[PDB]
Ligand binder design. Structure first.
Ligand code: ANP
Lengths: 339, 17
């Protein structure tokens, strides 16, 4: 008696029942459900990664990181359902706390008060401080990756693209939230740019750099920030795109007050420091929390840190999907009876 | 959905104190 949703088997029962379609996502359908054992509502992500190495990669990383992470502002994994043998496992079901919506969905329907904008921003940075303490880069931060409640509680999700920060060493529908140096040159700075981009989107209810492709993305960023001062040029390592930037016509910086005319001055000032073109000059997570825009919520004693760094020394993109399937089977074993 | 006051959030309640 496996339960069906939109002609798709969701085999989560008898524990989880009353399935309701939420949305589609990478490789899988998400549903709200009732957990009959704990008498609580949950979200359940059905994942069918096993035909694609890349999908397997994102699933393992996600499971590993979310299980290691414990924070108020980061979504957790409550339970994971899968077949009792590896040959029988064609799907993995990830059970999480049910959140009412995500920031992307909210911004379609609703304009945000500068109050809610400020508080949302604080939670993003508070979650990110923890992430960066574990020396992990999220690398995918965007509004759909930010889960929300009507009680204004925010949680960061979707760690599938996350990895340990190293200086130095695959899509992704949107380049909109990706740092300029990613197009050019990894580092904690790239998550800050993303957060800068999300803040801008809460302000105007539109993406600040909605580029249609690689170079168009650059032209968007440059249309706002203007052409780099140098010192930005010449802090660039790859010399092929430095000269590309030199070969570009001049662009004027658009002052953050002309855009976002209705925005807090303190917000715009912080926006400026997240959105700096040079990664080295870009504001760090703990400095951002300490910015006057967040003074209302800033409390470093209540802003918890990771106990140690997170460890991925394991092989990243190279592993065969059969092996990854073995690893996913092992990682999810703690949720199985007899473990 | 529609957003409740910020004070509905528990973390925000720890801020008001
Ligand atoms: N814990 C949750 N509670 C409520 N809704 C969720 C939860 N997790 C994901 N969703 C929703 O499920 C849908 C798909 O997101 P997701 O499952 O994360 O797929 P994805 O491609 O991995 N992530 P994304 O890039 O944001 O679409 C979205 O509409 C989300 O709002």
């Amino acid at each position: 008696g496996p339960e069906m949703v939109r002609g798709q088997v969701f085999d989560v029962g008898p524990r989880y029942t009353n399935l309701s379609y939420i949305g589609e996502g990478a490789y899988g359908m998400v549903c709200s459900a009732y957990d009959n054992v704990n008498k609580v509502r949950v979200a359940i992500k059905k994942i069918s990664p096993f035909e694609h190495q890349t999908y397997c990669q994102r699933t393992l990383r996600e499971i590993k990181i979310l299980l290691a992470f414990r924070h108020e502002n980061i979504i957790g994994i409550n339970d994971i359902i899968r077949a009792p043998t590896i040959e029988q496992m064609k799907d993995v079901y990830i059970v999480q706390d049910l959140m009412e919506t995500d920031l992307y969905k909210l911004l379609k329907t609703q304009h945000l008060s500068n109050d809610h904008i400020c508080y949302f921003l604080y939670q993003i940075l508070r979650g990110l401080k923890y992430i960066h303490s574990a020396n992990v880069l999220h690398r995918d931060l965007k509004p759909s990756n930010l889960l929300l409640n009507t009680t204004c509680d925010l949680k960061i999700c979707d760690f599938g693209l996350a990895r340990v920060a190293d200086p130095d060493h695959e899509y992704v529908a949107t380049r909109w939230y990706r740092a300029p140096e990613i197009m050019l040159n990894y580092t904690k700075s790239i998550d800050i740019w993303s957060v800068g981009c999300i803040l801008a989107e809460m302000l105007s209810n539109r993406p600040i750099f909605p580029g249609k492709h690689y170079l168009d993305q650059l032209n968007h960023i440059l249309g706002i920030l203007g052409s780099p001062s140098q010192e930005d040029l010449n802090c660039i390592i790859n010399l092929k795109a430095r000269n590309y930037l030199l070969s570009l016509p001049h662009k004027n910086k658009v002052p953050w007050n002309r855009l976002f005319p209705n925005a807090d001055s303190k917000a715009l000032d912080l926006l400026d420091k997240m959105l700096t073109f040079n990664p080295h000059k870009r504001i760090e997570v703990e400095q951002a929390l300490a910015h006057p825009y967040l003074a209302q919520y800033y409390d470093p004693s209540d802003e918890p840190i990771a106990e140690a760094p997170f460890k991925f020394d394991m092989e990243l993109d190279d592993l065969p999907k059969e092996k990854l399937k073995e690893l996913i089977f092992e990682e999810t074993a703690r949720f199985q009876p007899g473990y | 959905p529609q957003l409740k006051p910020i004070e509905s959030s528990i973390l925000a309640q720890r801020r008001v104190r």
